[PDB]
Amino acid sequence: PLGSRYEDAYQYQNIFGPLVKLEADYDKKLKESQTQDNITVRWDLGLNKKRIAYFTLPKTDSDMRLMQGDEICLRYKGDLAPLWKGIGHVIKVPDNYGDEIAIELRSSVGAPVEVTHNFQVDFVWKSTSFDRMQSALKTFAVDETSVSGYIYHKLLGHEVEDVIIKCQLPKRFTAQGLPDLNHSQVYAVKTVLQRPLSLIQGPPGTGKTVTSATIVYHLARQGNGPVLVCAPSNIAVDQLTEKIHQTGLKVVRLCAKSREAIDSPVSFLALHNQIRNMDSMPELQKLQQLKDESSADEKRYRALKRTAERELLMNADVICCTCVGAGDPRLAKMQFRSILIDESTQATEPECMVPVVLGAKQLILVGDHCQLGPVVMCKKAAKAGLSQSLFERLVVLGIRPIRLQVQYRMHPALSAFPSNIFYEGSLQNGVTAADRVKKGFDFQWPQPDKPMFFYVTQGQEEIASSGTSYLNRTEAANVEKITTKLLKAGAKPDQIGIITPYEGQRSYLVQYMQFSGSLHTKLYQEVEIASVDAFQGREKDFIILSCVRANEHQGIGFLNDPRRLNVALTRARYGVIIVGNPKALSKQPLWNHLLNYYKEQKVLVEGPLNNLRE
Ligand SMILES: Nc1ncnc2c1ncn2[C@@H]1O[C@H](COP(=O)(O)OP(=O)(O)NP(=O)(O)O)[C@@H](O)[C@H]1O
Ligand SMILES: [Mg+2]
């Protein structure tokens, strides 16, 4: 793809720097060309004494997904002129609680509360993440202690005499609150602790994230400073934060300042939440109550929060953050001896380099290049080398990943197809059918010993009322019938996921399951519905795919990307149900194999209380 060898870090910066600038300009253009205007706001001083405007935008399934934290710029327009400008940040996006975007605006005064149409939602571009990428390339080139010198040479592809990191290993490598390790995982931990640089590779469910949590536990039990743990996406970092919390380490989850409205299983571990509960600093406590219920108290509250952050950050055992989030100014002046990056194959190399240059002497990279890769909008940058992850470049350089092969997530039948198509049948099972026979679940499949079937459903795929996305109302109905059948059978709502490629299908499934659901509306609200991105590195007991397209033209998500389908088929533990049109999905070498294998196992069925289909 691109020459993996480099003379020095100056030359490295000169290659990657322009690539990053190419990506920064491209999606600056794209963001500023995504303006809506015919929208109607919904003003109200939200119960936390801060103005929170609501609005609905046309359903568009893009790759630049509007996330919680993005800066948005309102604009009152039309004939009736308190015409002004107002800036805020996204406190909520389309989800299970209705498909309405909320923002929490900074200032609350000049904004007219005349809830009146003809506004203009502009997506404010931030160079933040690209600035951090460029800054990290500069630190690699200029800062002598950015990396250990061994790692400096190994990252540039130089020939280096091997170094053995000396340390007192533990007697036993399994960590307390995590699963008992394999021989392969025990080997991975033992080997990793004594190498300055290591890659860990492995198919879905093979304990990469658990093994990473275990490694971070032992690195923390050394006398060093805080271990830095990263992943490219917020979802993957939450997965890792949770496993590390289970070992009993003092964890701090750093996130961007605007993403404090997020709620995950370990949201309480976040820095902004830990600071609210500072029992050692009652005075920022007094000021925090003040902002809820001035100008001088603002600069004092600001510096008081800066002090509390420094205290928890410098005194933590582990700091979990996004790769890009490692370049956060609050982590400036800090250095990290040990650094691990889960899901490293999902990041571009400059993004992945943001944490690395903060003093790395021991570096662990965990990945799977058959799962989600980097997202590069600009095709020119991608072709010029930005699409290759750090992990993958080191593999070309000859470092051999420690490999995990035994999965413990899925049922043998579920892992059968993904292994043969994506991993050459080299993904095997450390769990059997007896282990994945859901306890307290009276449901019988169209073929026992095989918790899976492709439900056939031809239907009118149409466009979304507002937007460019697609949906399939006939399938949606069938997906609620499957969801209702699983819930009555014993399955808990929070252990069912529904993956679908399109935004129009997601939005429709949320409203339709709640309104027209047989059971309580609160139960369908508890069932997650999203694209594969939402389930990155995660697992549910049951998954339901909803392939929307019943037409001729290309798809987008798991319809035409091998990476995304693999991830879609490897989230389930106890069973998976795919819903879609066999004919429409057939025009795709990957999906035509799926339909063949399912027909051979006598699970290509149709019509409630079902039987085989041709
Ligand atoms: N040695 C083990 N023994 C028993 N169960 C295990 C073991 N390792 C992992 N598991 C199970 O697998 C789950 C953790 O899988 P995980 O560490 O997230 O795999 P992963 O490689 O990160 N999957 P992915 O992120 O999709 O590539 C846990 O719920 C465990 O029950
Ligand atoms: Mg994972």
XYZ file of C-alpha atoms and ligand atoms in Angstrom:
646
model
C 0.000 0.000 0.000
C 2.639 2.500 1.166
C 6.313 2.136 2.052
C 6.459 0.891 5.633
C 10.134 1.869 6.115
C 11.204 5.391 7.143
C 14.603 7.094 7.547
C 13.546 9.077 10.623
C 10.494 10.625 12.323
C 10.814 13.853 10.265
C 10.229 11.843 7.075
C 7.403 9.947 8.767
C 5.706 13.277 9.568
C 6.207 14.516 5.996
C 4.336 11.486 4.591
C 1.455 11.255 7.082
C 1.030 14.986 7.755
C -0.199 15.884 4.243
C -2.512 12.821 4.292
C -4.165 14.079 7.500
C -4.519 17.595 6.038
C -6.182 16.037 2.986
C -8.775 14.334 5.225
C -9.279 17.466 7.343
C -10.076 19.648 4.322
C -12.369 17.062 2.711
C -14.796 16.630 5.634
C -14.571 20.322 6.534
C -16.074 20.763 3.065
C -18.576 17.976 3.730
C -19.741 19.251 7.143
C -20.228 22.813 5.875
C -22.269 21.345 2.977
C -24.870 19.633 5.192
C -27.126 22.564 6.132
C -30.859 22.154 6.809
C -33.237 25.144 7.094
C -36.959 24.260 6.828
C -36.765 22.717 10.336
C -38.815 23.913 13.315
C -37.184 24.216 16.738
C -38.716 23.435 20.150
C -37.449 25.919 22.744
C -37.585 25.349 26.520
C -35.421 26.080 29.578
C -34.633 22.421 30.331
C -35.035 21.435 33.998
C -31.269 21.869 34.589
C -31.751 25.664 34.083
C -30.072 25.510 30.640
C -31.836 26.206 27.322
C -32.247 23.003 25.274
C -33.659 23.270 21.730
C -35.163 20.277 19.901
C -35.498 19.680 16.159
C -35.968 16.912 13.591
C -33.655 16.480 10.601
C -34.156 14.410 7.416
C -33.138 10.758 7.851
C -29.745 10.425 6.128
C -27.560 7.342 6.601
C -24.088 8.814 6.061
C -20.680 7.903 7.537
C -20.364 11.325 9.201
C -22.966 10.384 11.813
C -24.074 13.291 13.998
C -22.885 12.284 17.470
C -23.541 13.554 20.980
C -21.077 16.410 21.519
C -20.958 17.945 18.033
C -21.257 21.745 17.961
C -24.384 22.963 16.112
C -25.206 26.559 15.157
C -28.885 27.560 15.076
C -30.116 30.594 13.127
C -33.498 32.352 13.415
C -34.620 33.355 9.917
C -37.702 34.291 7.886
C -40.108 37.238 7.909
C -40.238 38.208 11.616
C -36.786 39.400 12.611
C -35.397 38.780 16.053
C -32.858 37.340 13.539
C -29.728 36.201 15.417
C -27.225 33.323 15.919
C -26.993 30.688 18.684
C -24.354 28.005 19.341
C -24.854 24.730 21.232
C -23.778 21.078 21.427
C -25.689 17.830 20.833
C -27.064 16.431 24.108
C -29.096 13.715 22.302
C -29.449 12.016 18.877
C -32.150 9.832 17.234
C -32.508 6.726 19.412
C -34.999 4.488 21.290
C -36.573 7.578 22.928
C -37.810 9.020 19.613
C -35.871 10.359 16.621
C -35.345 13.979 17.697
C -31.991 15.803 18.001
C -31.578 17.915 21.152
C -28.843 20.516 21.756
C -27.720 22.287 24.945
C -26.785 25.852 23.963
C -23.974 27.638 25.838
C -25.630 31.053 26.224
C -29.262 31.464 27.342
C -30.467 35.039 26.799
C -30.553 36.429 23.240
C -32.171 33.266 21.853
C -35.836 34.045 21.040
C -38.230 31.474 22.551
C -40.704 32.116 19.699
C -40.879 28.473 18.544
C -41.041 29.307 14.838
C -40.051 27.474 11.659
C -37.583 28.590 8.953
C -34.496 28.156 11.166
C -31.050 27.005 9.960
C -29.186 24.128 11.611
C -25.515 24.352 10.604
C -23.036 21.638 11.567
C -20.050 23.528 13.019
C -16.762 21.944 11.932
C -14.028 21.315 14.502
C -10.403 20.731 13.491
C -9.704 19.280 16.998
C -9.098 15.622 16.068
C -6.954 16.502 13.029
C -4.968 19.061 15.058
C -4.163 16.349 17.581
C -3.080 13.977 14.807
C -0.708 16.619 13.348
C 0.533 17.567 16.811
C 1.387 13.902 17.478
C 3.396 13.627 14.245
C 5.296 16.721 15.393
C 5.943 15.235 18.854
C 7.243 12.005 17.307
C 9.712 13.981 15.169
C 10.772 16.621 17.723
C 10.335 15.191 21.243
C 13.241 12.944 22.243
C 11.268 11.156 24.985
C 8.082 10.711 22.904
C 8.994 7.023 22.570
C 11.654 4.681 23.981
C 14.154 4.532 21.125
C 13.629 0.805 20.698
C 10.014 1.600 19.764
C 11.269 4.558 17.715
C 13.344 2.189 15.570
C 10.695 -0.553 15.428
C 7.942 1.875 14.372
C 10.095 3.223 11.526
C 10.902 -0.307 10.302
C 14.582 -0.190 11.217
C 16.520 -3.297 12.124
C 16.754 -3.386 15.924
C 18.352 -5.864 18.331
C 15.550 -7.335 20.463
C 15.017 -5.925 23.962
C 13.667 -7.913 26.911
C 11.678 -5.687 29.282
C 12.669 -6.949 32.734
C 9.853 -7.182 35.290
C 8.601 -9.440 38.082
C 5.865 -11.509 36.444
C 2.848 -12.599 38.514
C 2.698 -16.164 39.846
C -0.555 -16.707 37.913
C -1.660 -14.616 34.931
C -5.470 -14.744 35.227
C -6.922 -11.551 36.719
C -9.371 -11.856 39.638
C -12.683 -10.543 38.279
C -12.231 -11.770 34.692
C -12.545 -15.248 33.094
C -9.913 -17.967 33.632
C -7.477 -17.560 30.747
C -6.678 -20.126 28.041
C -3.167 -21.398 27.501
C -3.139 -19.091 24.431
C -4.299 -16.074 26.451
C -1.992 -16.970 29.371
C 0.815 -17.070 26.823
C -0.313 -13.742 25.366
C -0.171 -12.008 28.778
C 3.140 -13.596 29.790
C 4.782 -12.696 26.472
C 3.348 -9.172 26.296
C 4.589 -8.175 29.764
C 8.230 -8.809 28.721
C 8.183 -7.250 25.219
C 8.452 -3.511 24.515
C 6.084 -3.955 21.525
C 3.437 -6.600 20.771
C 0.442 -7.204 18.521
C -2.457 -9.467 19.557
C -4.667 -10.775 16.732
C -7.821 -12.902 16.850
C -11.328 -13.557 15.456
C -14.537 -12.438 17.225
C -15.179 -13.648 20.763
C -11.630 -14.948 21.317
C -11.014 -12.842 24.436
C -8.906 -10.023 22.972
C -10.604 -7.377 25.125
C -10.568 -9.609 28.239
C -6.900 -10.419 27.597
C -6.173 -6.704 27.200
C -7.929 -5.956 30.486
C -5.793 -8.706 32.075
C -2.573 -7.242 30.674
C -3.503 -3.759 31.917
C -4.124 -5.238 35.377
C -0.570 -6.604 35.677
C 1.002 -3.461 34.152
C -0.850 -1.496 36.831
C 0.470 -3.791 39.606
C 3.963 -2.640 38.673
C 5.313 0.493 40.384
C 4.818 2.677 37.288
C 2.460 5.611 36.715
C -1.042 5.317 35.219
C -1.428 2.880 32.307
C -2.959 4.438 29.180
C -5.635 2.378 27.430
C -7.240 3.432 24.139
C -9.465 2.425 21.271
C -10.575 4.453 18.206
C -14.324 4.468 19.059
C -16.111 5.432 22.303
C -18.056 2.145 22.169
C -14.900 -0.012 22.110
C -13.346 2.000 24.970
C -16.441 1.466 27.168
C -16.130 -2.268 26.575
C -12.532 -2.163 27.750
C -13.205 0.250 30.632
C -15.773 -2.194 32.014
C -13.479 -5.230 31.918
C -10.691 -3.246 33.627
C -13.097 -2.006 36.304
C -13.845 -5.684 37.040
C -10.215 -6.284 38.130
C -10.598 -3.602 40.825
C -8.252 -0.934 39.458
C -8.799 2.799 39.973
C -10.092 3.768 36.519
C -10.776 7.170 34.991
C -12.730 7.333 31.731
C -11.730 10.530 29.929
C -14.119 11.849 27.272
C -14.482 15.119 25.361
C -16.128 17.970 27.299
C -19.327 17.917 25.200
C -19.928 14.142 25.588
C -20.871 14.258 29.292
C -24.541 13.518 28.507
C -23.551 10.001 27.353
C -24.755 7.041 29.430
C -22.981 3.646 29.357
C -22.644 0.854 31.993
C -19.495 2.597 33.329
C -20.506 6.243 32.774
C -20.031 6.819 36.517
C -16.308 6.163 35.937
C -16.132 9.240 33.662
C -14.028 12.207 34.783
C -16.894 14.704 34.727
C -18.993 12.400 36.963
C -16.123 11.559 39.365
C -15.493 15.300 39.821
C -19.105 16.015 40.842
C -18.518 13.502 43.656
C -15.272 15.050 44.974
C -15.563 14.671 48.756
C -11.989 16.007 49.135
C -12.702 19.347 47.376
C -15.949 20.870 48.806
C -15.804 24.337 47.174
C -16.028 23.283 43.541
C -18.991 21.394 45.035
C -20.530 24.690 46.214
C -19.858 26.290 42.817
C -21.325 23.330 40.877
C -24.636 23.743 42.701
C -24.493 27.461 41.756
C -24.371 26.779 37.989
C -27.408 24.487 38.373
C -29.694 26.826 40.374
C -21.972 34.338 37.603
C -18.877 35.603 35.690
C -16.263 35.795 38.464
C -17.428 32.431 39.847
C -16.989 31.029 36.305
C -13.201 31.548 36.120
C -12.787 30.154 39.655
C -15.027 27.124 38.995
C -13.020 26.530 35.808
C -9.612 26.499 37.498
C -11.036 24.428 40.378
C -12.222 21.774 37.918
C -8.815 21.868 36.205
C -7.199 21.068 39.570
C -9.601 18.205 40.353
C -8.988 16.690 36.892
C -5.209 16.811 37.416
C -5.654 14.999 40.752
C -7.766 12.069 39.519
C -5.788 11.756 36.272
C -2.325 11.711 37.870
C -3.466 9.391 40.709
C -5.335 6.786 38.606
C -4.158 3.240 37.939
C -5.686 3.290 34.437
C -6.846 6.084 32.127
C -9.260 4.961 29.424
C -9.916 7.211 26.457
C -10.409 7.322 22.717
C -7.176 7.396 20.614
C -7.946 10.954 19.488
C -9.035 11.772 23.036
C -5.528 10.965 24.303
C -4.427 14.271 22.772
C -6.793 16.070 25.157
C -5.151 19.156 26.748
C -5.966 17.720 30.218
C -3.565 14.851 29.416
C -0.852 17.340 28.386
C 2.358 17.310 30.421
C 1.528 13.691 31.321
C 3.608 10.732 30.174
C 2.616 7.059 29.941
C 5.095 4.205 30.241
C 2.681 1.434 29.226
C 0.066 1.856 26.484
C -2.489 -0.628 25.094
C -4.857 0.014 22.168
C -7.766 -2.379 21.627
C -9.473 -2.325 18.228
C -6.309 -0.735 16.808
C -7.136 -2.050 13.308
C -10.145 0.301 13.271
C -7.944 3.440 13.318
C -5.789 5.237 10.773
C -2.135 5.279 11.744
C -1.898 9.010 12.692
C -5.013 8.671 14.901
C -3.480 5.605 16.560
C -0.206 7.534 17.031
C -1.834 10.199 19.264
C -1.485 8.123 22.478
C 1.748 6.390 21.429
C 3.843 9.595 21.424
C 3.033 10.341 25.096
C 6.138 8.466 26.302
C 5.548 4.862 25.195
C 8.171 2.345 26.371
C 5.880 -0.704 26.255
C 3.166 -0.736 23.572
C 0.445 -3.325 22.989
C -1.775 -3.270 19.907
C -4.814 -5.537 19.689
C -6.798 -5.944 16.478
C -8.663 -7.948 13.857
C -8.440 -6.644 10.271
C -11.521 -8.694 9.303
C -13.632 -6.506 11.619
C -14.279 -2.734 11.407
C -11.497 -0.805 9.667
C -10.644 2.903 9.471
C -13.205 5.374 8.112
C -11.521 7.587 5.500
C -13.952 9.887 3.672
C -11.392 11.236 1.185
C -10.655 8.615 -1.493
C -7.466 10.468 -2.484
C -5.994 10.253 1.042
C -7.109 6.611 1.334
C -5.260 5.633 -1.860
C -2.149 7.593 -0.836
C -1.850 5.435 2.322
C -4.190 6.775 5.028
C -6.418 3.658 4.992
C -3.739 1.390 6.517
C -3.751 1.077 10.310
C -0.548 1.101 12.384
C -1.282 -2.511 13.349
C -1.397 -3.608 9.698
C 1.796 -1.738 8.746
C 3.758 -3.488 11.506
C 2.439 -6.832 10.204
C 3.905 -5.973 6.781
C 7.154 -5.047 8.592
C 7.317 -8.589 9.947
C 6.249 -8.420 13.597
C 4.140 -11.533 14.154
C 0.947 -11.114 16.176
C 0.338 -13.379 19.166
C -2.804 -15.230 18.041
C -6.017 -16.198 19.839
C -8.207 -18.788 18.074
C -10.734 -20.156 20.613
C -13.988 -18.186 20.989
C -16.266 -18.313 24.070
C -19.098 -15.991 22.977
C -21.095 -17.837 20.321
C -22.810 -21.201 19.885
C -20.903 -23.534 17.478
C -23.528 -23.164 14.700
C -23.365 -19.339 14.806
C -19.548 -19.261 14.522
C -19.582 -21.842 11.700
C -20.257 -19.461 8.795
C -18.061 -16.495 9.901
C -15.030 -18.766 10.449
C -15.174 -20.461 7.025
C -15.733 -17.296 4.949
C -13.514 -14.793 6.834
C -10.922 -16.807 8.818
C -10.284 -20.014 6.765
C -12.087 -22.223 9.303
C -9.412 -21.339 11.890
C -11.929 -19.993 14.422
C -12.846 -22.834 16.812
C -15.129 -23.135 19.827
C -14.262 -23.305 23.530
C -17.997 -23.441 24.238
C -20.563 -26.078 23.146
C -24.333 -26.286 22.573
C -24.958 -27.336 26.197
C -23.306 -24.103 27.365
C -25.387 -21.910 25.014
C -28.844 -23.380 25.618
C -30.439 -20.265 27.111
C -31.666 -21.042 30.632
C -35.295 -20.061 31.199
C -36.028 -19.756 27.480
C -38.892 -21.851 26.080
C -38.450 -21.183 22.349
C -38.059 -23.841 19.660
C -36.275 -23.029 16.418
C -37.023 -24.427 12.934
C -34.060 -26.763 13.574
C -32.834 -27.539 17.136
C -29.042 -27.803 17.640
C -28.957 -24.687 15.416
C -30.277 -21.464 16.999
C -30.550 -19.587 13.679
C -32.716 -19.016 10.601
C -33.104 -16.665 7.635
C -36.746 -15.553 7.713
C -37.869 -14.823 4.142
C -39.763 -11.570 3.613
C -40.294 -9.848 0.277
C -41.603 -6.301 0.630
C -41.808 -2.820 -0.861
C -38.534 -1.070 -0.062
C -39.154 2.672 -0.374
C -37.474 5.999 0.386
C -37.866 7.889 3.679
C -40.610 10.552 3.874
C -37.910 13.145 4.616
C -34.288 12.402 3.660
C -32.321 10.048 1.386
C -32.324 6.857 3.514
C -34.393 3.722 2.817
C -36.693 1.418 4.792
C -38.925 -1.662 4.514
C -42.172 -1.517 6.489
C -43.108 -5.133 5.706
C -39.848 -6.442 7.200
C -40.121 -4.070 10.154
C -43.443 -5.706 11.046
C -41.860 -9.161 10.821
C -38.945 -7.991 12.998
C -41.400 -6.934 15.732
C -43.092 -10.340 15.434
C -39.726 -12.043 16.012
C -38.892 -9.651 18.875
C -42.274 -10.248 20.513
C -41.879 -14.025 20.138
C -38.447 -13.992 21.817
C -39.604 -11.823 24.746
C -42.619 -14.038 25.541
C -40.292 -17.056 25.316
C -38.215 -15.777 28.261
C -35.530 -13.605 26.647
C -34.909 -10.322 28.467
C -35.247 -7.108 26.382
C -31.725 -5.815 27.178
C -30.219 -9.007 25.693
C -31.693 -8.520 22.205
C -30.067 -6.378 19.530
C -31.353 -5.479 16.078
C -28.782 -4.516 13.453
C -29.926 -2.730 10.286
C -27.882 -0.823 7.669
C -30.300 2.075 7.073
C -31.405 4.988 9.263
C -34.947 4.930 7.864
C -35.330 1.326 9.005
C -33.903 2.097 12.460
C -36.200 5.076 13.081
C -39.247 3.174 11.821
C -38.477 0.108 13.956
C -38.273 2.280 17.094
C -41.669 3.966 16.689
C -43.386 0.844 15.290
C -42.268 -1.544 18.052
C -43.412 0.884 20.781
C -46.772 1.926 19.265
C -47.846 -1.355 17.669
C -46.000 -3.773 19.964
C -48.058 -6.507 21.648
C -46.292 -6.093 25.012
C -45.444 -3.073 27.199
C -43.871 -0.098 25.389
C -41.031 0.060 27.955
C -39.780 -3.393 26.873
C -39.368 -2.510 23.172
C -37.643 0.703 24.283
C -35.085 -1.483 26.102
C -34.198 -3.380 22.886
C -31.253 -1.791 21.065
C -31.599 -0.850 17.386
C -28.678 0.519 15.351
C -26.101 -0.218 12.645
C -23.163 -2.570 13.347
C -21.089 0.359 14.717
C -23.193 0.410 17.884
C -22.360 -3.259 18.584
C -18.593 -2.936 17.958
C -16.750 -5.250 20.357
C -19.975 -6.101 22.179
C -22.305 -9.064 22.599
C -26.025 -9.714 23.010
C -27.742 -13.049 23.727
C -29.842 -12.673 20.563
C -29.334 -10.602 17.401
C -31.802 -9.895 14.600
C -30.457 -8.603 11.298
C -32.822 -6.533 9.170
C -31.431 -6.253 5.651
C -33.643 -3.537 4.187
C -32.874 -3.589 0.424
C -35.484 -5.649 -1.559
C -34.302 -3.921 -4.766
C -31.490 -4.231 -7.348
C -28.946 -1.507 -6.441
C -26.056 -1.691 -3.935
C -26.392 -1.560 -0.151
C -24.225 0.316 2.377
C -23.592 -1.351 5.751
C -23.350 -5.114 6.197
C -24.883 -5.437 2.702
C -21.672 -4.816 0.709
C -18.766 -4.530 3.202
C -17.272 -7.903 4.284
C -15.923 -6.362 7.512
C -19.380 -5.155 8.581
C -21.184 -8.435 7.864
C -18.603 -10.421 9.830
C -19.164 -8.131 12.820
C -22.954 -8.372 12.361
C -22.890 -12.187 12.400
C -20.573 -12.451 15.423
C -22.405 -10.455 18.121
C -24.834 -13.213 19.182
C -24.251 -15.764 21.948
C -27.397 -17.918 22.054
C -28.970 -17.293 18.622
C -29.320 -15.107 15.502
C -32.287 -14.432 13.162
C -31.764 -12.716 9.779
C -34.744 -11.031 8.076
C -34.672 -9.969 4.427
C -35.329 -10.697 0.753
C -33.313 -13.707 -0.526
C -33.557 -12.558 -4.177
C -32.430 -8.955 -3.608
C -29.498 -9.914 -1.362
C -28.475 -12.645 -3.845
C -26.642 -10.147 -6.097
C -23.537 -10.179 -3.891
C -21.007 -13.063 -3.783
C -20.817 -12.809 0.027
C -24.590 -12.868 0.628
C -25.231 -15.626 -1.944
C -22.922 -17.880 0.097
C -24.869 -16.998 3.277
C -28.174 -18.040 1.702
C -26.657 -21.279 0.369
C -25.237 -22.398 3.729
C -28.510 -21.577 5.517
C -30.504 -23.612 2.955
C -28.140 -26.586 3.400
C -28.713 -26.555 7.178
C -32.513 -26.488 6.612
C -32.988 -23.014 8.142
C -34.064 -20.950 5.094
C -37.693 -20.743 6.277
C -40.846 -18.590 5.818
C -44.304 -17.805 7.277
C -45.107 -17.971 11.039
C -44.801 -21.538 12.415
C -42.466 -22.050 9.508
C -40.973 -24.481 6.981
C -38.206 -24.572 4.302
C -38.133 -22.294 1.221
C -36.744 -22.640 -2.317
N -10.706 -17.889 28.753
C -12.044 -17.711 28.718
N -12.880 -18.586 29.332
C -14.222 -18.462 29.335
N -14.854 -17.451 28.719
C -14.060 -16.465 28.034
C -12.615 -16.546 27.999
N -12.209 -15.482 27.289
C -13.342 -14.802 26.917
N -14.473 -15.400 27.371
C -15.880 -14.972 27.175
O -15.971 -14.076 26.062
C -16.503 -12.819 26.471
C -15.456 -11.750 26.244
O -15.108 -11.698 24.869
P -14.153 -10.510 24.391
O -12.892 -10.347 25.331
O -14.934 -9.133 24.290
O -13.699 -11.050 22.955
P -13.178 -10.075 21.801
O -11.959 -10.752 21.070
O -12.813 -8.621 22.323
N -14.494 -9.932 20.686
P -14.412 -8.721 19.461
O -14.152 -7.330 20.172
O -15.783 -8.727 18.685
O -13.245 -9.064 18.435
C -16.826 -12.877 27.951
O -18.221 -12.684 28.119
C -16.405 -14.255 28.417
O -17.494 -14.957 29.013
Mg -13.451 -6.221 21.733
